[PDB]
Amino acid sequence: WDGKIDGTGTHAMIVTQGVSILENDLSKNEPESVRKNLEILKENMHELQLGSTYPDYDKNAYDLYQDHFWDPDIDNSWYLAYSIPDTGESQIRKFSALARYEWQRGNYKQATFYLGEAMHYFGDIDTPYHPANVTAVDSAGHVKFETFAEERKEQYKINTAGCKTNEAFYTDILKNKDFNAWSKEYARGFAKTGKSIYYSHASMSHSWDDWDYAAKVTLANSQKGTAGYIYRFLHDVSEGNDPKNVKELVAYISTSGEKDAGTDDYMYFGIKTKDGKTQEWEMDNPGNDFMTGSKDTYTFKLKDENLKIDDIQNMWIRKRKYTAFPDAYKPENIKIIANGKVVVDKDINEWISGNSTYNIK
Ligand SMILES: [Ca+2]
Ligand SMILES: [Zn+2]
Numbered sequence: 001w002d003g004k005i006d007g008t009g010t011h012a013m014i015v016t017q018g019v020s021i022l023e024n025d026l027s028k029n030e031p032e033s034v035r036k037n038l039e040i041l042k043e044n045m046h047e048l049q050l051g052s053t054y055p056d057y058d059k060n061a062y063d064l065y066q067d068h069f070w071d072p073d074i075d076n077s078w079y080l081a082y083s084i085p086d087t088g089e090s091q092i093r094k095f096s097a098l099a100r101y102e103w104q105r106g107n108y109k110q111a112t113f114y115l116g117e118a119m120h121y122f123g124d125i126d127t128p129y130h131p132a133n134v135t136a137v138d139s140a141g142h143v144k145f146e147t148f149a150e151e152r153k154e155q156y157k158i159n160t161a162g163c164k165t166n167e168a169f170y171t172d173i174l175k176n177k178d179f180n181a182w183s184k185e186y187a188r189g190f191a192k193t194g195k196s197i198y199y200s201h202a203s204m205s206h207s208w209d210d211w212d213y214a215a216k217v218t219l220a221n222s223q224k225g226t227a228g229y230i231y232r233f234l235h236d237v238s239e240g241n242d243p244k245n246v247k248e249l250v251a252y253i254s255t256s257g258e259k260d261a262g263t264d265d266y267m268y269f270g271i272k273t274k275d276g277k278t279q280e281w282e283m284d285n286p287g288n289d290f291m292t293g294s295k296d297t298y299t300f301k302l303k304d305e306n307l308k309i310d311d312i313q314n315m316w317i318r319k320r321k322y323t324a325f326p327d328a329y330k331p332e333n334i335k336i337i338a339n340g341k342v343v344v345d346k347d348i349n350e351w352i353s354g355n356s357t358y359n360i361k
Contacts (some may be wrong), residue, residue: 007054047112055091058294060294063288068091095114107119127222131204141204156220248338263290266282269283273307314359333346
């Protein structure tokens, strides 16, 4: 969907309605804590709206908004040595992890921003063009549609999911104790309806009164869906809800803003287990990794499927010199996420030059 940096436009309308919907649908057999936190969230609506639009303006190693797409329909030896690429689904899981982390420890303003960011991605897999994986290159309808829907966003608003917090839609959301598990499938459902509406109503072929129907559905879905996620979120952070085997690791690396803090040198993330076995992946996204000031996301696929978090005794990033050109690197902070829970939050702000191997755990 379209979004403007000041937190306005289709994306902001979706989160804004998502909240307003959760109010109108909120059950009476609903805990004091949940009702209280939703107040906190409304207290930070501006940040929820800003996070909802922002991912379209983040300078990443994703030169092309790659992480904003996802084929809900679609592993191997290669990814034991390389970082896996993120998706619209993947990002929901990551920002929801950050949102929960900040909340549990007090920063509600930034927690709410992160949560709004997660919802940017969900809104996107609820577009017709992103789940169908049709880029603005792939087809001229991507942009013309998202814009058609921009100019009309208002007339597609919805006040309710249709159920109540006691009813069906909202109780399945809570049914599954594993967030990451629930989120993938929840999101898959909505995203699947997207691919479908592309082919039938919202493609460049399919018509103009076809596009009106197309936007109505997907924007309404984006609202009912966004409300679901927020609801889930509100519950998850009132009980200290806590999502097992570590099969993946997500590293969210914030690079410093100071000049020449970025590196065009090779970067690796690695671990050593309690036993003594080790794995290293190259941190390598589509575009330019580790630019000055960017915040990058690397997902890592463990070779030992049956591993638990405490068994991972060590964690480090490692530089290897690209040339004789001195790209020394300054990480501002790095978070490691394992199963929807942040598990490392090392601030750094040191310089790494040469082939140094900084340890973070
Ligand atoms: Ca590359
Ligand atoms: Zn969008």
